[PDB]
């Protein structure tokens, strides 16, 4: 995930 | 909502979203690897990004946590993202 | 290394404004003490005919920040993102399949 | 304050  | 798409494989959310022409499309997906919570898959370019709904105690919603170590890059940060909600405010040094 | 000509100290809120009031730049801004909260920071900016302050925020863990943006349902957090990027180092709005 |  792009933001993890 | 017509963006929900349930249990859709992040696979088949790729297969599916590749074939949209507009940077943006997306849809919702109960995720594969961690049962329980939602994943946000869009497509941007020849990709397919994937991410994470985060969730707190109160139950929120959220894609990321924006914060800063210190005054000084609160300030920077600011010079190109807005510091109001409705309206374009971006810090400008005084002159 | 320069010090940083935005940072004022202790001076009043209404200084703030009179002294941003007279810039000619939306966006003109400095940060200061505030009086009013002792121990807190308040960001002045310059922004039309008017002058405004927010509160600088902080967590248990000493963070810096303006605002704490969170949704109570996913199509709210959907709708915010319509206008808002989801992503951080690129600009990207969410718009329906068709 | 804006943000409060």
Same mark, same amino acid.
């Given at each position: 995930?792009?933001?993890? | 909502?017509?963006? +929900? +798409?349930? &249990?859709?494989?992040? =696979? &088949? @959310?790729?297969?599916?979203?590749? &074939?949209? !022409?507009?940077? $943006? @499309? +997306?849809?919702? !997906?109960? /995720?594969?690897? =961690?049962?329980?919570?939602?994943?946000?898959?869009?497509?941007?370019?020849?990709?397919?990004?994937?991410?994470?709904?985060?969730?707190? $105690? @109160? $139950? &929120?919603?959220?894609?990321?946590?924006?914060?800063?170590? /210190?005054? %000084?890059?609160?300030?920077?940060?600011? !010079? /190109?993202?807005?510091? /109001?909600? %409705?309206?374009?405010? +971006?810090? !400008?040094?005084?002159?």
């Amino acid at each position: 995930y792009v933001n993890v | 909502h017509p963006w +929900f +798409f349930g &249990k859709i494989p992040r =696979a &088949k @959310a790729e297969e599916m979203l590749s &074939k949209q !022409r507009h940077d $943006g @499309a +997306f849809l919702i !997906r109960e /995720s594969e690897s =961690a049962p329980g919570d939602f994943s946000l898959s869009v497509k941007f370019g020849n990709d397919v990004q994937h991410f994470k709904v985060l969730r707190d $105690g @109160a $139950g &929120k919603y959220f894609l990321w946590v924006v914060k800063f170590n /210190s005054l %000084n890059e609160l300030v920077d940060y600011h !010079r /190109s993202t807005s510091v /109001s909600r %409705n309206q374009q405010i +971006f810090l !400008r040094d005084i002159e």
